Amino acid sequence: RSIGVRIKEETEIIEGEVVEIQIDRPATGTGSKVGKLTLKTTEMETIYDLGTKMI
């Protein structure tokens, strides 16, 4: 407990205000969900095409 291992975790984050979201769901199917999400800041905004585990 008295030997420290010190790790820098450096990662990239997106930090934004949600403008709109679309989630698409099959009529029954195998479950291949898909969707789009949009994020804003006081300066900039953009659209993301979403992945399956993100959804």
Binding site: Q22, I23, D24, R25, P26, A27, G29, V34
Partner: protein, 34 residues
């Protein structure tokens, strides 16, 4: 009559020039939504 003696060359020669050209230009270049 006399033209065939030349056609036997020139019909092939126009094809040689074209084949050379087209070679040389390569050789020088559902769902619901929420």
């Amino acid at each position: 009559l006399t033209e065939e003696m030349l056609l036997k060359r020139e019909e092939r020669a126009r094809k040689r020039r074209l084949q050379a050209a087209r070679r040389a230009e390569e050789h020088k270049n559902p769902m619901v939504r929420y």
